[PDB]
């Protein structure tokens, strides 16, 4: 069971080192390409794919972005729950909390319908 902060902390150094490695291999591919094209063939060695490098870099970047976004969403959820409901859970009777949530939803829907009828009357 890994945590968002833990996964972020373990992914950041992997991301940095992957960036370093991909930049090194890109520079190697570039100098090899120039030596074979501009000058004479001197780098008699096979280079790397060079596609997997930045591909996995972008993959880890997307992973980090989405997990940090999930953590932000969780914090926002907690904040909005604490603002729209008191901190009470098994203390508060669960059916009463469900009824209160249903009434809150109905009240919000009523306010929205009132504003919509208002806008329509403005039309």
């Amino acid at each position: 069971d890994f945590d968002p902060v833990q996964r972020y902390k373990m992914l950041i150094p992997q991301l940095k080192e992957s960036l370093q490695t991909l930049m090194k291999v890109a520079a190697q591919n570039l100098i090899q390409n120039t030596n074979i094209d501009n000058g004479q063939k001197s780098s008699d060695a096979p280079l790397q794919r060079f596609d997997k490098c930045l591909e996995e870099f972008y993959a880890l970047c997307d992973q980090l972005e989405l997990c940090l976004r999930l953590a932000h969403e969780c914090l926002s959820q907690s904040c909005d729950s604490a603002k729209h409901s008191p901190t009470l859970v098994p203390s508060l009777p669960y059916p009463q909390y469900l009824a209160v949530i249903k009434a809150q939803i109905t009240c919000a829907k009523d306010i929205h319908t009132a504003l919509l009828d208002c806008a329509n009357k403005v039309t």
Partner: protein, 167 residues
């Protein structure tokens, strides 16, 4: 940290800046697929025809447009068309007492000078004693004006000296 790409770009002396194309664009177009990142047509003529060709440098035009309507500037014999660009023949048509029109010939818009030149003054000022006092006051004021300017400073100082030296 990755100075390797820096030293490689330093190495990129030869004129064939097309190997980097085959080196980079395959994967770029593979993982990123905007083949048309700007399909909007771009075809405009940069310079067809744009010139005034019908008046003086418009700098002095925009300057003189700001001055008070009590100053009436006209056109003298044609000797300040483009380079000199200014023949400040002005009349102080207002409620105050009138006087002799100033000359105030400034220089090209670079402004390494000012307007006051006072050619027709030799007989216009020494004849009338009061106008002579006006000229004395105007000279004393202009000499105390650090780097006066084309129209605003000169005409303002001239008007204030003309309507201060009444006494």
């Amino acid at each position: 940290q990755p100075l390797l790409d820096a030293v490689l770009a330093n190495i990129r002396s030869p004129v064939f800046n097309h190997s980097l194309y085959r080196t980079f664009v395959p994967a770029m177009m593979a993982i990123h697929g905007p083949p048309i990142v700007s399909p909007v047509v771009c075809s405009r003529k940069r310079r067809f025809e744009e010139d005034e060709r019908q008046s003086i440098p418009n700098v002095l035009q925009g300057e003189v447009a700001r001055l008070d309507p009590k100053f009436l500037v006209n056109l003298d014999p044609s000797h300040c068309s483009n380079n000199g660009t200014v023949h400040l023949i002005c009349k102080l048509d207002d409620k105050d007492l009138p006087s002799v029109p100033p000359l105030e010939l400034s220089v090209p818009a670079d402004y390494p000078a000012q307007s006051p030149m006072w050619i027709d003054r030799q007989w216009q000022y020494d004849a009338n004693p009061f106008l002579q006092s006006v000229h004395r006051c105007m000279t004393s004021r202009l000499l105390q004006l650090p780097d006066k300017h084309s129209v605003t400073a000169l005409l303002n100082t001239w008007a204030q000296s003309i309507h201060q030296a009444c006494l």
